[PDB]
Amino acid sequence: TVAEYFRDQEGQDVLLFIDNIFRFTQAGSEVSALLGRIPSAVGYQPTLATDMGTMQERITTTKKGSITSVQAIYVPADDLTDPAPATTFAHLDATTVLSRAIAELGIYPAVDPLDSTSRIMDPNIVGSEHYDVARGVQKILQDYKSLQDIIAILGMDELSEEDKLTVSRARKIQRFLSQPFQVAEVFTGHLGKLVPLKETIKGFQQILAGEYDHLPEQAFYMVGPIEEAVAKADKLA
Amino acid sequence: TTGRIVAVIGAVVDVQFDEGLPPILNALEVQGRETRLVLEVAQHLGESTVRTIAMDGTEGLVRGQKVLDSGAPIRIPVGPETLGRIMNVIGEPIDERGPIKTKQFAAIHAEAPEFVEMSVEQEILVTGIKVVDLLAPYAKGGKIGLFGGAGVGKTVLIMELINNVAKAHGGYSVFAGVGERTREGNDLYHEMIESGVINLKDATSKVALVYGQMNEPPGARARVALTGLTVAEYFRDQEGQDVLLFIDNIFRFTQAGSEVSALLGRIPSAVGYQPTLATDMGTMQERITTTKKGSITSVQAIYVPADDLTDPAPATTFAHLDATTVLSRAIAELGIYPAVDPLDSTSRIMDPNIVGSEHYDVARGVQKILQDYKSLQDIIAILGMDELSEEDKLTVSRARKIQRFLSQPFQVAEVFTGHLGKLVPLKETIKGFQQILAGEYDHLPEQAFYMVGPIEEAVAKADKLA
Amino acid sequence: KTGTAEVSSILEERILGADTSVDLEETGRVLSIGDGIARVHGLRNVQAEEMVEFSSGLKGMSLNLEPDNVGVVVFGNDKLIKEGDIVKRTGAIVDVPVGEELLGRVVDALGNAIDGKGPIGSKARRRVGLKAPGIIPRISVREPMQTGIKAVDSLVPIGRGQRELIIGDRQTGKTSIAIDTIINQKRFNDGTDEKKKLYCIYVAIGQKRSTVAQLVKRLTDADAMKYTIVVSATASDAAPLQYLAPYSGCSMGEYFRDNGKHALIIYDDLSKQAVAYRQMSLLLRRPPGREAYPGDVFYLHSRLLERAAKMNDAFGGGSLTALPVIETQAGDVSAYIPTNVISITDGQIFLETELFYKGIRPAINVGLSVSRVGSAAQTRAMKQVAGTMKLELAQYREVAAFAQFGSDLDAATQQLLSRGVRLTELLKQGQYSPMAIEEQVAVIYAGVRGYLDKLEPSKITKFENAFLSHVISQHQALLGKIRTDGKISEESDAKLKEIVTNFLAGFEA
Amino acid sequence: VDLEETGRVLSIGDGIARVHGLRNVQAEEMVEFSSGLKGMSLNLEPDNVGVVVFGNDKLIKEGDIVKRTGAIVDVPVGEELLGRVVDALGNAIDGKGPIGSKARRRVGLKAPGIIPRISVREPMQTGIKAVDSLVPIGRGQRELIIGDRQTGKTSIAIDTIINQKRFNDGTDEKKKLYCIYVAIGQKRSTVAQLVKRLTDADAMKYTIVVSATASDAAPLQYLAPYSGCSMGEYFRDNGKHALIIYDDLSKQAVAYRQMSLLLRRPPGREAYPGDVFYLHSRLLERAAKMNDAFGGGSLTALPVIETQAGDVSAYIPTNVISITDGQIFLETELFYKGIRPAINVGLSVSRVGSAAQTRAMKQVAGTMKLELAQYREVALDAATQQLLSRGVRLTELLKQGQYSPMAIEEQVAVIYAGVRGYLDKLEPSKITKFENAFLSHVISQHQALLGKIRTDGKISEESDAKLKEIVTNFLAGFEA
Amino acid sequence: STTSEQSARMTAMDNASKNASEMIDKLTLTFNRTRQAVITKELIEIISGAAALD
């Protein structure tokens, strides 16, 4: 209700942080029983969809401003078939699925890359340089997963070699996404390094170009733009 | 007060009590009831109605009947004359050797000592089973939870333990066959009598038998448990006597409870499991311990519902444990008797202190070996195995050997096994493993360790293999 | 309230003071009927557990004596009943007619000979409301009972009074097995083996009539039917009826037991019952629990099953031996009802399809097949060879485990396999294979002394028949003797052996 | 006659007294029964009062008069529970007669405000290297102790508690942490030993033990934490630092659900009622690290969760998880191996642990943590073999069994050694041995240094050179 | 050697699959069960394990 004021009235491009809608929904669900109502499967509140719907639809970009909605969604057991997230997606425009695995892979940004998506992306919209780089990236990495399966047989420095190159690249790529945090001296120690966009697209595009195919692999970890990663290799040796 | 059976809907007998009522728990005797059909008021169902539990059969009963409150809960004979008696829940000799004329009767709700009132300290008893002592040493008052399959020799094992212990330990016993297999009580009977653990020449024994067989109404089966419980406190405090309390099966108790809960038109929780699952236990378990006046050591059989332990019931169980022997079916299946799980056949109360620090360390090392070894199992399972590295392979073997060595023959089931049972002195055990830890049984194969007593005999056995 | 009784024929007179009806205490008017649970209004003085009779000739039982009405389990179908209907007590709970004039019958469990004799009804009835004997009443299962199935009789040798689970899948010869036994009991029953005057009770739970029909036909054929009740609750049934059937049998069999005779009940199967009953409960609303089953499905059964026993002397020492059946699905055992049953049953008989595909009918998982009972269930005859054999097989199997890198690793193990295999050949049995112990031990003997181990596996069987026909022919003497001495006597053995060696020589050559 | 403040026990389930009347009772009033029991008129039904009975009856028979006490519950709170075992009513099952706590405070009071609250910056330590190191921890903080059974778990809490001995018995005003052990559903025995243990260990003088043993009636067992909570706030808000160890909430929940169900107030997921996150949430939100107004005080929450087979996906665990500021996950295999710590480190978590602890440790620990990662990771290379060597050394080094707490400085010292690979020049068994000797060596000698290191709050470079030298001397000089 | 090895590689690769084959089978049970366990469990919740009996 407040934000709608600003949006329409104050025009504002609202950034709306919600942490977490999940708790709302959950709150709804909690009551559901006690509202006498049936809850739902997965415990929910039967009305969940509208609850959401009305809400999600409550907010938008009119031609009376925009509420840009940064909505934290706790995802229990990161289980997303977990009806709530399952629904959520419809109301999402860009889905950011943060991957605990990746987090575990030490990465910060710890994201789930392939599931942090926007159905939106396009070689038009984002330009193909963007798009394509991404599709290539998305591709290779998923394929790399296929390769993990190989590696399980074949080992830390033994495979089929082109494929090895790409593996290694994937290993760089991974690292290249890793990015410091100014806030988090506590998580990073580092201080944030921001990458202005082109430098990113290029960043990977270049990696894709394999221009560092002789550069160290984790000379990509916790960086800002790609140069600095190159720089970083030197800093080692 | 007198009540009228207003509903018998199954053995939930709703009696509306009409000369008032006493409080809950008060035991009612149904009037017109053939035998003494005690209904225990369970709830004041309200409106001077109680939900009560029949523990007898209700067949043929004219409803509308008249129940006369026995005015208190159920009291049952207490005093030593109960040792060498098979009592049913309601006292009543199902030894059927005629009465158990006791001087004391007791209402089966016995209580728990306040903190100050209970010896706040533990002991270390031991058992003579390698596997046990080593991994779960003993103590007194301690309730051990024993998992696995009756007559794998789960049940047998219990007996064997009794077999050495009651005799050896003076401090009395209670055996609670909750939903007991009547037959198993019979045989056992001829045996006990015979055995002179049960003495009939002297009504007493060293041990009182409580059987509350399966065919009893659940209420009875559920309640036979408190009954026994009441007794041991009698023995402890009153008789000094340090009961070993065999519960077979507390789960069967429980089952009777849950089943009951349901019928009690309550909400018996997840899986149907009684709301009160815990409270029944808590209240009960705390009626067990080493008080100052003795110890009621529980040997608690828990047969595993649908064989799962993540099952809340066992979850609960755990809270009260002192030692747990979780038999592994896998192990049992691996043709290992004892059937042990070597990962929660435990005592927290194994400490370098409680047992030898060595004992403990050796154990930790062992515990380790097994623990690591298991890790390999998965891998091995997938992948064949041999390139892990040999030391591990050694551990593996050792572990297996250890496994086999933990397999410890049993005389009582020599009949089956042809294996002469072995109850093992502590040293042989410690040593046993130490030797194995020293990995000396090089050449010597796995099966050279199967079903022996002291470790030498295994060494010997390898030789016998040769 | 319960809009029932707010029936304004019901209400409509209590109001008036114009009431007085059916009895509403010894008879009731069906408040509603649906669900086979005839809420029958009234029924107050109503006996508990009482069989009532409906105004349909259908029987019902007064399960829940509710203060208003009775949840009445219907012994029929309520397409054959309707609302309001007067249910008059029968006053009495269930007893089932019990006696002996059932041996030779296929009845419905309502004791009406669906065979087509109609009830050759027992004068007496005996309570299904009857319960298990006491500890003291029992004196141990020791009396064997041997099926004429070598494998069984040896390895999970069978006592009496017992309760042993028959477990196995979709007519994996399961029934075939049951028959071979039944036929086998014939000789004892054709003996006047009063110890083994084993009255067979076939509780058919849920079997569609045709399934029964071959089977019964088979029993007829085995003429074993003569000492046999076939308690029959077919697929066409109301559920309680299938449910009831064991209990019915239960009244009946304990009578033999208690009259010194030996009763055998085959419950085939409680799996269906359990379902049915659970369902029944559930239909009654009446709980479920684990696997949707009410918890007292255990009680139900437990209570049911304690009633099978091997008695003490008071009971003529007799038995009611239970061979319960559960038909497995994929050996599902934490399968609650299996879990239960296992803890109850005093060993269990595993059947395995593979073995079946192997032709090995019977299909047994021996390793698991266990007689918790074990030694008590035997005879020395068997004990003497079977002891070693069982053991030898144990090893064989262990080594059937260990048979695939070459088993020619050590001689023993190759051997164990060869030997084992020989024995394996022996333990497969045809369909319709009752057997006599002396042959069985004979045949075993041959193998455990390895003579057959000096023979090609195919010919083992071949021998076996031949050997049988041979010994039957000549060494009838000996067969008499093994039976006589009750064991393999060392002499009988020497003659036997001698026979074997010669016979073997004749068989092989 | 009050059927509007008093009631007649209409029906009593056996713990839920449906009480006819009571009306005028205010919601969530403690009532008192004519069985002498307490109750809470929890459920104000439009007819009768679901009164959760705070007692055990067969004393109640229907019609029993249920009397208002006329009070919404408060509990005695204070600071004199230190050296006391209590039950939630404020009675003291210690049998030390009754407590010294005397001010009473609603357990129903809620979560501090942001400004009242003041972020952690305040260390928190256990004498357990791994913990203090690998969890960087402050006070105020929720950290879940999660694990199945004292498997040292319970030990874990103890070593910490014991550790506080040096501090509370030190004049570490700031590290004067009132320990609140809410013992929820614990066998009396367990407690007995424990009680004894702690007593023997005497942390107990600066310690509340709220003891709701296994038997104890469920709402009570349930209540005990809230009680404890009120009491701990008592310190918190009063500048001081209380540590409540909620031990364990699994059992509380259970009880609670059960309670609900008996109130026929519905279940929820896993048959557990819907508020149950909330349950704790509100509870734990009442825990805080305060601002200055509260003397800066804190109530550090070490809630405990007992998992069932490490299953945490489990609604309630997830619940809890989503609240806590991390967890101490314990893994059996290592325990079982004898490795105490037994932890699954990965699973033990501090989202942002480091913002309320200590440079000393930090200086060695960050880097170390990482090395261990690397060491761990790799399921030969001299490096890796090294990491392994190190790692294993360090394993010993973080290995302090059950019954082993410490002053920090001792810990940093030994850690330092290990991080200098000094230890890698030793057989792993002898790390432990060495460590013992070494420790008594520095204790002896370089108590000087340790005193200082403790003093600098950090490790000085200078100290390092002395230390290096020390260590080396001991090292070398007892390397055999 | 190499012939041996390669032929051995088949062998190794067999071996693996024998193991596999079984497991695969077994898991499939584990499956049903966890499924059913599930299904059922909900069906409970469903069967007024969240309904009438909320």
Curated annotation (Swiss-Prot), chain A:
Compartment(s) where it occurs, according to its Swiss-Prot or TrEMBL record: Mitochondrion inner membrane
Residues with the Phosphothreonine modification: 25
Modification Phosphoserine occurs at: 128, 146
UniProt modified residues of type N6-acetyllysine: 139, 193, 198, 235
Modified residue annotations for N6-succinyllysine: 235
Family per similarity comment: Belongs to the ATPase alpha/beta chains family.
Summary of the function given for this chain in its UniProt record: Catalytic subunit beta, of the mitochondrial membrane ATP synthase complex (F(1)F(0) ATP synthase or Complex V) that produces ATP from ADP in the presence of a proton gradient across the membrane which is generated by electron transport complexes of the respiratory chain. ATP synthase complex consist of a soluble F(1) head domain - the catalytic core - and a membrane F(1) domain - the membrane proton channel. These two domains are linked by a central stalk rotating inside the F(1) region and a stationary peripheral stalk.
Subunit structure: Homotrimer. Component of the ATP synthase complex composed at least of ATP5F1A/subunit alpha, ATP5F1B/subunit beta, ATP5MC1/subunit c (homooctomer), MT-ATP6/subunit a, MT-ATP8/subunit 8, ATP5ME/subunit e, ATP5MF/subunit f, ATP5MG/subunit g, ATP5MK/subunit k, ATP5MJ/subunit j, ATP5F1C/subunit gamma, ATP5F1D/subunit delta, ATP5F1E/subunit epsilon, ATP5PF/subunit F6, ATP5PB/subunit b, ATP5PD/subunit d, ATP5PO/subunit OSCP.
Protein name: ATP synthase F(1) complex catalytic subunit beta, mitochondrial
Organism of origin: Bos taurus (Bovine)
From Swiss-Prot, chain C:
Membrane-topology annotation of the record: Peripheral membrane protein
Chain positions recorded as Mg(2+) binding sites: 175, 268
Predominant location category: mitochondrion
Residues carrying N6-succinyllysine: 117, 123, 186, 195, 217, 261, 383, 454, 462, 487, 495
Family: Belongs to the ATPase alpha/beta chains family.
Subcellular location: Mitochondrion inner membrane; Cell membrane
Note from the entry: The siderophore enterobactin (Ent) produced by enteric bacteria binds Fe(3+) and helps bacteria scavenge iron ions from the environment. As a consequence, the mammalian siderocalin LCN2 plays an important role in defense against bacterial infections by sequestering iron bound to microbial siderophores. LCN2 can also bind iron bound to endogenous or nutrient-derived iron chelators and plays an important role in cellular iron homeostasis.
GO biological process, one term: proton motive force-driven ATP synthesis
Residues in the signal sequence: none
Modified residues (Phosphothreonine): 90
SUPFAM superfamilies reported in the protein's UniProt record: C-terminal domain of alpha and beta subunits of F1 ATP synthase (SSF47917), N-terminal domain of alpha and beta subunits of F1 ATP synthase (SSF50615), P-loop containing nucleoside triphosphate hydrolases (SSF52540)
Pfam families given in the database record: ATP-synt_ab, ATP-synt_ab_C, ATP-synt_ab_N
Function comment: Subunit alpha, of the mitochondrial membrane ATP synthase complex (F(1)F(0) ATP synthase or Complex V) that produces ATP from ADP in the presence of a proton gradient across the membrane which is generated by electron transport complexes of the respiratory chain. ATP synthase complex consist of a soluble F(1) head domain - the catalytic core - and a membrane F(1) domain - the membrane proton channel. These two domains are linked by a central stalk rotating inside the F(1) region and a stationary peripheral stalk.
Omega-N-methylarginine PTM sites in chain numbering: 160
Reported modifications of this chain: Acetylated on lysine residues. BLOC1S1 is required for acetylation.
Glycosylation site positions: 32
Residues under site feature: Required for activity: 369
Modified residues (N6-acetyllysine): 79, 82, 88, 117, 123, 186, 195-196, 217, 261, 383, 390, 454, 462, 487, 495, 497
Protein known as: ATP synthase F(1) complex subunit alpha, mitochondrial
From Swiss-Prot, chain E:
Localization per Swiss-Prot or TrEMBL: Mitochondrion inner membrane
Residues where N6-succinyllysine is found: 26
Known partners and oligomeric status: Component of the ATP synthase complex composed at least of ATP5F1A/subunit alpha, ATP5F1B/subunit beta, ATP5MC1/subunit c (homooctomer), MT-ATP6/subunit a, MT-ATP8/subunit 8, ATP5ME/subunit e, ATP5MF/subunit f, ATP5MG/subunit g, ATP5MK/subunit k, ATP5MJ/subunit j, ATP5F1C/subunit gamma, ATP5F1D/subunit delta, ATP5F1E/subunit epsilon, ATP5PF/subunit F6, ATP5PB/subunit b, ATP5PD/subunit d, ATP5PO/subunit OSCP.
Function: Subunit gamma, of the mitochondrial membrane ATP synthase complex (F(1)F(0) ATP synthase or Complex V) that produces ATP from ADP in the presence of a proton gradient across the membrane which is generated by electron transport complexes of the respiratory chain. ATP synthase complex consist of a soluble F(1) head domain - the catalytic core - and a membrane F(1) domain - the membrane proton channel. These two domains are linked by a central stalk rotating inside the F(1) region and a stationary peripheral stalk.
Family: Belongs to the ATPase gamma chain family.
Name this polypeptide is given: ATP synthase F(1) complex subunit gamma, mitochondrial
